[PDB]
Symmetry: D2
Subunit: 343 residues, 4 copies
């Protein structure tokens, strides 16, 4: 017997937010880096990690030129960045919503190793999640993000890891959809190792199928859900070389065999690629001559901001130039969303 | 680790046959009625059930006018009809392939009641299936058909019935794809009882999701598979009345939430409807203003041939008129495939 | 491929602790009541809920006579009670270990309603659980407790609720076994409603089978795990009456059809029964003439302490008499562990 | 909601037959060899395979001395042997029931390779099984046998093979229990290759757990079911050497972690061992100092009859001596059932 999880108005908000995020030509900037990863990135660039430098760097990211207004539909933030204010006086969620963007927040509490596996981990962060999503919904967060990690090994991914990560993602998305927050499932598959297109495509099919079975099990309103997969790409130690067209064909085959078409949009990871390779691959994916009945766009953390961070270097007066650099990649990625990119 | 079930040439035959079957404007005639059901139908029309009458009736179905040549892409036969010859001397598979059609065969051995359930049955017919499909492949059968039955009850469909029927359908489709025969999965849901659009839509989602999970489990090449679902329609004793647009919206929602877009085409059942209601509903489904990234066509057993059987009556000299009647429905259903039908 | 979750020494501690807890004639006192439930219980008895009254009541429970030393193998505490000290100066974990008992702690963070179900809830409390169990392991907690809730309804327990609760229990037990803490799974089935012995026995089989499948999936070392089920008992509004022998037969049938015999012991709930009915039923269960290859004992929260709380009334000078009352039930329950109880 | 598969009288026959089969000190002779395997065995001994030689050899097996009357509780036959008569005039089922034995029949139709796996096969034989079991029940068959095959490889047994074989075994046992025939599940794991005690024990746990989950899913009355597993033994190419006590400890650990104690008895395979090694191992298993709450006995096809077949050689006049040889092993295996064997 059916007791509906959602009223039709709840489905209306989830569908409208998911359509406004993944709108044609728009993408996702992921400024959600935690203090450890951003500490590594500020230590590489050669500055001290303080709250002021992090706030100023996200100022450099967020208040860039109005040319990125038809580029970014939504920005993912850390928890701390929701309660930081810009030097103009405006809080960063209002900064995001003022230029048409949507506020999100990365909500997981890290990765926990699973017993008995070969280095396989699950994700943490389920306690207090309804109250926290209610609080973030009061502060203007309209979507969320959760990151599960899987690695390709000798006999990994085992069935235990895929089952547990799919069940956790479905539980998370149910809780987020209860509170009027569009969830984004991110089934990340680690690119480390040496494996061809074929095996990585294979485990991509198994992982995405288990995810969508668990989503059907937990009554998830799939019209208000976004998918964040990685492009099927060979391992870093894999010796074989492939054109970008084969990678695009393999991605669209791995999606067209799994993703049911009510899922509103597909946002890709960069996954340790270069700044240009991700845009080239996404432009290839948007040019693949099969029938792709959803939005195909980008959600790039490092691939948007890495070289702009390099051109910043920790000095304020370089800012505009660094900001200009960021805009460049954004504009390129916008063309990568519509297939009209050419390098 | 991946050991591929299919060579790329095997995928090439399966994809080419599935594309030739479900080709735009074409549909499926199901003349696959067994001796019991066709015995009931000949006893209703008032003639004796012999081999000659069955052969002559399928002669009346199969050698109709050439106007049905851009109508039927494929015909489903009983096992016996593959070894019957027409009075011209040509065997019925050659009759089908001569006018552009594709030969199929219904291969299941009936329904077996499941213990411990409330009148829920599974399907039979797995033994010797590789040899039988090899034999039918030698005789010109290029696709198959398997029919599982589920009924909506108080606490039915239980998880046991859906799991067992999905596993049996996946096992069947693996065996058929091994031998170069395009399988057609038919997840029939019984329209008996009293239940709204909502509950029947709900169990349609659960059943189709479990089916596609089991197909992903058994490495089924989904580009060479056809889907045969029923239209989500209220029960026969249900008191509420619905327009055809609501039924079309519910069907395309129940498909767009489940069917991955590499599945080549969707052929509907008639499911106890009238001869005109099925064409009206299919014309509505082809006019629904959502994105349907596959072929939507008909596979009508009774809805093509019932009134033509009535106009036959068991007398040979009425034949042409009866045949003319059949052509009428076929032409209508062809328009129901392209959305340009108007009654 | 097998990467062992546990070293053999880890299996040795888990097995030794589980054997010391469930040792023949010993049981579990559950003083783990949170502030809301114990607030209701102090408000029923007519005293104000303060930290001093709670500490003093658990003083009344814990420092009772030495006759309970061969009665209680282990005590379950709230988190707060681990950091309270007795008026002698000794902390309550040392009080427990001084008279032969083992310290436990209830670790879940409550129940969260599942979307789309009919009032079905999951359990919360997975974040930070490895660090918290490391901290409690430093403070002397050697076992844990987690409480999932399921209710018998019209079409409940659904498959979603049982699957999610089993996966959460297995994840919890893996985390606890990683840190050297013996987990106790508690699959509670709510006794509310009107349902016979038959349906409650049925859903007990389904729930326990799904739990043990999920435990086999997560590589749980079942020799170091305790099971905390409820006795299969009809609903509160059920009109049919049953002898205690039928309840004992149904419990031992529902366990002997599911529990694999390496699971070290089975501790029952009281589940809203009377103070005497639970002891009578446990004495019947220990007299059932089938082969029960594990320890069958009690884990009684209310059924040990309710009437002793009544004889306390909130006044200190009644203490000994109230404590004497507690000892009575404990002694009775000890006989209920060995089948030699007679009321 | 519960609709009981079995009336209590049906449970009474299944329990009584299962108790009479596995009765203390009794075992199973498996004369169920099909024409191919027995053709290989008659070709090794150097005689022509005819119906007369097969009938005469099973005469040599079945009408041996009355000292085997407290040895064999039941005999498994091929389908053909049920309709062969002895030269006295009595049919072989009456021969079996006259000396206290129970007639069984091997009912599967062979093994079929699974697509996409690495040499993994499922089992066949489900069609017409209710009618065939009704027919064999009329002829005196009171139990059955079904044989699924799994091999230990690099990345095998995969989850697909274990799931499919468990579902097929449960479906088979439901059908057999519907007709009043006690099923015997045989989850055979192939001993070929090189693998230690540890990995074979591991996959034994996974396989048996999946089997019992599928049996709980299909409402199987486990008091009327027998289990036929193999002893966990290293591979034929494995270099490490183990005492028989370690093999006995590993078997009883792999059973005590999985088998719920209502399953009436456990009958072992010989699995390519010597004639003496199987009896030594079973005598060790019956001497393992853990709590084994079921009957542990033998079901030996080759290990009972191989050397007796050797002492036959295809000549009639050697018969008695050959028969005497058979009795020897039987008597030894009877002691192997009670732990009082000493070689």
């Amino acid at each position: 017997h059916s007791h509906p999880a959602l009223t039709p108005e709840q489905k209306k908000e989830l569908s409208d937010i998911a359509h406004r995020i993944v709108a044609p030509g728009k993408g996702i900037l992921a400024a959600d880096e935690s203090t450890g990863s951003i500490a590594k990135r500020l230590q590489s660039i050669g500055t001290e990690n303080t709250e002021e430098n992090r706030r100023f760097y996200r100022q450099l990211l967020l208040t860039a030129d109005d040319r990125v207004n038809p580029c970014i539909g939504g920005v993912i933030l850390f928890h701390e960045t929701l309660y930081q204010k810009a030097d103009d006086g405006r809080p960063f969620p209002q900064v995001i919503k003022s230029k048409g963007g949507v506020v999100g927040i990365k909500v997981d509490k890290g990765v926990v190793p699973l017993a008995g596996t070969n280095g396989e981990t699950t994700t943490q962060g389920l306690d207090g999640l309804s109250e926290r999503c209610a609080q973030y919904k009061k502060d203007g967060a309209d979507f969320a993000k959760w990151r599960c990690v899987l690695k390709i090994g000798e006999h990994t991914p085992s069935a235990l890891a895929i089952m547990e990560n799919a069940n956790v993602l479905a539980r998370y998305a149910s809780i987020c959809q209860q509170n009027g927050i569009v969830p984004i499932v991110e089934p990340e598959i680690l690119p480390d190792g040496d494996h061809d297109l074929k095996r990585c495509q294979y485990v991509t099919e198994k992982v995405l199928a288990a995810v969508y079975k668990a989503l059907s099990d937990h009554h998830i309103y799939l019209e208000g859900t976004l998918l964040k997969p990685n492009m099927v790409t060979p391992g870093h130690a894999c010796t074989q070389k492939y054109s970008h067209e084969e990678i695009a064909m393999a991605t669209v085959t791995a999606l067209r065999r799994t993703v049911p078409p009510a899922v509103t949009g597909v946002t890709f990871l960069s996954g340790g690629q270069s700044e240009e390779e991700a845009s080239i691959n996404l432009n290839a994916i948007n040019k693949c001559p099969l029938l792709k009945p959803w939005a195909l766009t980008f959600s790039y953390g490092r691939a948007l901001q890495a070289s702009a961070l390099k051109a910043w270097g920790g000095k304020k007066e370089n800012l505009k130039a660094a900001q200009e650099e960021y805009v460049k990649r954004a504009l390129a990625n916008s063309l990568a969303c519509q297939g009209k990119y050419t390098p």
